Amino acid sequence: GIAREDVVLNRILGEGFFGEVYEGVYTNHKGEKINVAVKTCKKDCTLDNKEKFMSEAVIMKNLDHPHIVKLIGIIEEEPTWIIMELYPYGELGHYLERNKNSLKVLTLVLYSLQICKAMAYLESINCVHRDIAVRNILVASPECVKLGDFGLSRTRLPIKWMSPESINFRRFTTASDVWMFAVCMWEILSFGKQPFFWLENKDVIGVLEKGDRLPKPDLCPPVLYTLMTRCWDYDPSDRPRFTELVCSLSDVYQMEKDIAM
Ligand SMILES: CN(c1ccccc1CNc1nc(Nc2ccc3c(c2)CC(=O)N3)ncc1C(F)(F)F)S(C)(=O)=O
C-alpha cells in the first residue's frame, strides 16, 4: 500500500474530465524513483462524479496489459489520488501531427495493432472502452502506445466516433467498440485528422443511414481500409470481433514488414 508521503507533485499536467492531473515522482520502498501522473477529482459533483472516478480506479486496479496505461497505485483517502506511470511523449494525436514526415505506415499499423490487442484483452475481461481515440492514447515510446484509462467501463459524447446503435439507443456493446476502434484506425492512418470534421454532431446518424463513411486514408493499404469497412457495417452482427481484427492486422503488419526491403 502506497502513501501520500511517497508522492511528490511537481506541476500540473492539465485538466482531466474529473479534475487536474499532476506530474510528480514516486519513491519505491527499495528507494527507487518513478515519474508518475496523478489523477484527482475536481470539485466533483456529489456522488455522481466521485463514483465514476472510483469506478475507473477499481477497474484499473484489475487490468494489466502492455498497451493499457500502467496503474502504479491508489491513495484511497482524501483527496483520493490515482497514480499512473507517466509517458513523457504525451498524446498520440499530437505525436502524430508532429511527425507526419518521419512515420512509416508500418508504424501507424503497429500502433493500431497494439490498440486492438488492448481491446481484445478488455473484451475478454468483460470491459468496454468508451474512448478509443487518439487524444486519449498515450505514446510510451516510438514503438509503443498505451490505451486510455478513461472511458474504461463495465454528457460530452464522441458522436463522431459512435456506432449508430450507440447513438439511438445508448447501447454500448463490444460490437459498437469495434466500430469506434476502426474510427481510431482511421485517425491514426490519417495523421490526427478529426473524423467527420465537416459535419456537426446532430447529423452523423443521418449520414451513416444513407451509408456514408469516412474516406480511405492516403497511406492506408486497401486490405486495411476494407477491414475498417466491415467494422462500420450498419449491422452489428456483421462486424469482426476483436480476436479476428488482431489476426488480420497481425497479417497486414507482418506483411508490411515484408514489403519493407
Ligand atoms: C495531459 N492530460 C492527458 C491528456 C490525454 C491523455 C492523458 C493525459 C494525462 N494522463 C497521462 N499522461 C501521461 N503522460 C502525458 C500526457 C499528456 C501530456 C504529457 C504527458 C506531456 C504533454 O505536454 N501532454 N502519462 C500517463 C497518463 C496516464 F497514465 F494518466 F493516463 S490531462 C492533464 O488529463 O488533460
Side-chain angles (χ1 to χ4, degrees), residues 2 8 33 39 83 86 92 116 124 136-137 156 160 170 172 212 236 239:
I2 149 214
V8 171
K33 290 184 181 196
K39 224 169 190 255
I83 304 110
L86 182 74
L92 177 47
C116 212
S124 103
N136 191 215
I137 285 145
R156 249 139 227 236
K160 257 97 133 304
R170 201 165 128 203
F172 278 101
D212 287 336
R239 356 187 143 135

Side-chain angles (χ1 to χ4, degrees), residues 164-165 179 213 228-236 238-239:
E165 351 110 25
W179 171 292
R213 302 283 187 274
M228 267 172 215
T229 254
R230 319 216 291 111
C231 303
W232 297 331
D233 232 294
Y234 204 98
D235 193 1
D238 292 342
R239 356 187 143 135

